[PDB]
Amino acid sequence: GSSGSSGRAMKCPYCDFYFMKNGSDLQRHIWAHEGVK
């Protein structure tokens, strides 16, 4: 699919959104649900 040739991405511990299993942007996306500036 458009997110990757084999699919099977990780899913967020707070919402419906997806990232690559070792992506650094996931840590910022989670810290944003935890309310960090």
Ligand SMILES: [Zn+2]
């Ligand atoms: Zn999320």
